[PDB]
Design a protein around this ligand. Structure first.
Ligand SMILES: CC(=O)N[C@@H]1[C@@H](O)[C@H](O)[C@@H](CO)O[C@H]1O
Ligand SMILES: CC(=O)N[C@@H]1[C@@H](O)[C@H](O)[C@@H](CO)O[C@H]1O
Ligand SMILES: *[C@@H]1O[C@H](CO)[C@@H](O)[C@H](O)[C@H]1NC(C)=O
Ligand SMILES: *[P@@](C)(=O)O[C@H]1CCCC1(C)C
Ligand SMILES: C[P@@H](=O)O[C@H]1CCCC1(C)C
Lengths: 538, 534
């Protein structure tokens, strides 16, 4: 008949879940819960509408479809890229979320972790194997929630001002899911008064944008930003550049029969097959680049009343705890996607000329003067032409500019203006990593340890990596529970101190115990965060 | 009667003097007139050759010091007084000095020609620290040094005017170099082997003779100590030179109008001391390491900026010796940087550091200043007083000396010259400046001249041996274009734009290092010009 633990009533109606085996014991999963009406046809580009209630029992027993998105084909069959590609069918009918909870259901309200995946706002899915929430829930006995949100043009094409494609609807998808958590998580044993958002890359930037948008800020209590920030040069776009990209995309697919009435242009875009839009998505970028994505949140005064830097600088953050961090080699992954001389399949020992050309690819759309300032800071003038050093320096350019320095600026401003901040650098290169050795610890490869994937018996992680994963999961849930990653009552472990704008302390996460260090690439980030903006104004 | 001390030059006959050194005697001829006195109507004009005289010129004592400002910041302090005039001031100052071995050489001897520094506003060949007797005895060279006009008298310029054309102090030096060509053989010197050496504004002067074709035939090698003609202080454009000349006229009660002739005529009626009293006030702002009347780029002595001439030059066949002291900037900080004094530790605050950056890098945009602060801040310790003191010393020294010298060395090397570079890292046991100043600007000179060998001074035995080493390097270079002694040393390798090798000079054996502040000088030499022009 029925298992009462696998049956739950939410405001929309009744749900049936599944019981998941894990190495440490059973977990209840409710996968594929509809939280919005499907944004098909006339609802493409529009804000999400809440799911209408249903009679009977919805089977929330497997992940639903991946939101329509480009699929990477740079290295076909390569494990390092395929792990990020969709593992369900692509559909515009994709607005579903997932809830994992302990089995049996918690007796008293349990803190909630809400995951927001990355993928540059053009890709990603909550169903990816590396986001499997069963291990976190089993190890640390929280409730975990993840949602799908529209990406690409479907989530972020913006004709600012228009009613028909206002932009930012993917962020509205995320907000609706968070509202769902407030109204419904108690039914699963979750505590709506203790919700911790966490996300990586574009998911981290999304987390930050919810920090900076007052209507979202009521829906959670803490935040974890892994390898991303809302103030990154890739994470937002201005109203005019968003309109330009939307209009060129419409133009490239025949709309209209180049601007005109916004209503007629969007109506024509709605008649195009989803895959047709995806096929032209990368062609609207203003130049060849890496770490730039066509359709991203737009600063239009609505979701974001100002740029994220301005909101960060002007914000009062007392009563907030954040945990932020980066991996050791943020920049390496992206270089093989356009930097001249780079391949995962050789050592990418570039020339000086290839370094100079790469600077313009990795810092697109800046003046020649600005590019020269980059070359000045990242050249070692005792060894200006050494290939190994140039390869490392271009990786630093791309990673500092897009991840480390935006994270460091956010960390410093939030700490100075009232928040308790904890910062990390993730320094372990997984035994199973398929990218070449020169890429180091690439962007995105801490996620599997945070989610406890090494505990999966069918995988081949070493034993101390399982210990490491257990330690990280324990750092993440303590912060979720207490706003403090340190273990409630001890002076045994070397202790993780808060990050402040003065001492700038952070810890290294790897197989050895915590080591405290100073400065999130402070000399470099002073260039990106303090000087370079003065140069672009003048 | 001592025939060794009697010489006939083209203008007439001279009587010299025998001097003692710890190694034996030398012959000195001091106060030889090489130009007509540039007095009255000749103020501001190019020098005229000295007309012949009858009788015997008394050349046994130094002549007058050219009119100049006298430092009064620390009255009676040895560290400033050793640079102040030690003879009476006069516009009748164009004399030069020759030291030769005793008895005079009877075989052509290589010649060293010393051009003193002093910001183009001060200096004298008669200063104790330039005493040429020890080099000549120990290394058996002929040594010549001249007085040249400084301040407004040597470099006031109304460009285009015939009454104050500018650069006449540089022409005083050229005239003395022509005098050497015509007369040095009468002393035993070889006019075909003349090495110019100078320090600070003297080194900038050496460099300008390198880049001016009428001077290039007057010497064969060059030594540039802590200075370069491409310094931001060593030259001035025509427009700013004219502005400074006209503000001096106004400050001393002269016209305009307007008309250059009437302006200069009125300036010529003013006592020399009056011009000196207003010299500092024609500068456009509060500053350190800036001087009012310096060489002017007007297309004549210099047909282009020294930067341009250095980049466009064919320097095959040139040998140069260049170098810097370990702490070029420290001395200058006590003359205007907020919070600095020789009498305390000068542990400044961030606010003083930021104000000091506009004093030490004057007349640049706010954006340029911000880039300086970016590069010279340690952003892990942005507020640490000791690090701020050191950093502002580095700003002043890099901008004014180290990076102009590094640029000269790299361009000359890459365009055919053989370059030797050094950093002088010995703090004199006798130094009277505070310890935080390190090895300041100018404090290698006394070692090059072998002053430590003077038994009435307090130098250590190891310091005397060190002076003897340096005198040997300098004279080896004058003789052969190569400072190295026969392999024992380690060897002193040439400086190249790629390897950037130089040696450290101190009590320990030579140690070869790479890069003359390469990271800081990429900022000053490569990036900052792009920023200022865009
Ligand atoms: C000896 C060996 O290769 N063992 C396993 C292999 O059976 C499995 O297919 C793989 C999965 O990643 O992990 C490893
Ligand atoms: C440290 C030391 O001995 N310094 C000497 C001092 O004794 C002597 O009185 C002075 C003469 O002016 O020369 C110096
Ligand atoms: C074109 O846009 C206007 C509003 O801008 C709208 O009212 C009108 O209905 C649109 N055209 C058609 C044919 O509907
Ligand atoms: P300048 C750059 O000419 O240096 C002088 C300042 C006063 C004493 C000197 C000769 C070292
Ligand atoms: C910066 P984010 O969008 O980076 C994405 C790209 C694929 C893997 C990933 C790290 C989740």
């Amino acid at each position: 008949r029925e298992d009462a633990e696998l049956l739950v009533t939410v405001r929309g109606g009744r749900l049936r879940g599944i019981r998941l085996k894990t190495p440490g014991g059973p977990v209840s999963a409710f996968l594929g819960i509809p939280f919005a009406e499907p944004p098909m046809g006339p609802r493409r580009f529009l804000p999400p509408e809440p799911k209408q209630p249903w009679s009977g029992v919805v089977d929330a027993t497997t992940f639903q479809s991946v939101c329509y998105q480009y699929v990477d084909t740079l290295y076909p069959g390569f494990e390092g890229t395929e792990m990020w590609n969709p593992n369900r069918e692509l559909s515009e009918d994709c607005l579903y979320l997932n809830v994992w909870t302990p089995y049996p259901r918690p007796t008293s309200p349990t803190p909630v972790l809400v995951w927001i995946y990355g993928g540059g706002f053009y890709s990603g899915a909550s169903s990816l194997d590396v986001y499997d929430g069963r291990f976190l829930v089993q190890a640390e006995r929280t409730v975990l929630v993840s949602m799908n949100y529209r990406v690409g043009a479907f989530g972020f094409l913006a004709l600012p001002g228009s009613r028909e494609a206002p932009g930012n609807v993917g962020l509205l998808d995320q907000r609706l899911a968070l509202q769902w958590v407030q109204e419904n998580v108690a039914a699963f044993g979750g505590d709506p008064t203790s919700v911790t958002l966490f996300g990586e890359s574009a998911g981290a930037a999304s987390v930050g944008m919810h920090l900076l948008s007052p209507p979202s800020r009521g829906l959670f209590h803490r935040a974890v930003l892994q390898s991303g920030a809302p103030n990154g040069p890739w994470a937002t776009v201005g109203m005019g550049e968003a309109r330009r990209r939307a209009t060129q995309l419409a133009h490239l697919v025949g709309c209209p029969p180049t601007g005109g009435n916004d209503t007629e242009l969007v109506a024509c875009l709605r008649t195009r097959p989803a895959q047709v839009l995806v096929n032209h998505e990368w062609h609207v970028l203003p130049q060849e680049s890496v770490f730039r994505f066509s359709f991203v949140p737009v600063v239009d005064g609505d979701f974001l009343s100002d740029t994220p830097e301005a909101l960060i600088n002007a914000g009062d953050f007392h009563g907030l705890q954040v945990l932020v961090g980066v991996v050791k080699d943020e920049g390496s992954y992206f270089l093989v996607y356009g930097a001249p001389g780079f391949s995962k399949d050789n050592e990418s020992l570039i020339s000086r000329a290839e370094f100079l050309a790469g600077v313009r690819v990795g810092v697109p759309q800046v003046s020649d003067l600005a590019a020269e300032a980059v070359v000045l800071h990242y050249t070692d003038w005792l060894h200006p032409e050494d290939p190994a050093r140039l390869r490392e320096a271009l990786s630093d350019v791309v990673g500092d500019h897009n991840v480390v320095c935006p994270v460091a600026q956010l960390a410093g401003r939030l700490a100075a203006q009232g928040a308790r901040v904890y910062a990390y650098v993730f320094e372990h290169r997984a035994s199973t990593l398929s990218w070449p050795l020169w890429m180091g610890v690439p962007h995105g490869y801490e996620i599997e340890f945070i989610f406890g994937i090494p505990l999966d018996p069918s995988r081949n992680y070493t034993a101390e990596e399982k210990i490491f994963a257990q330690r990280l999961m324990r750092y993440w849930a303590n912060f979720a529970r207490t706003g403090d990653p340190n273990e409630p009552r001890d002076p045994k472990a070397p202790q993780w101190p808060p990050y402040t704008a003065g001492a700038q302390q952070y810890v290294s996460l790897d197989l050895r115990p915590l080591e405290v260090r100073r400065g999130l690439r402070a000399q470099a980030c002073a260039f990106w965060n303090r000087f370079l903006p003065k140069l672009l104004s003048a």
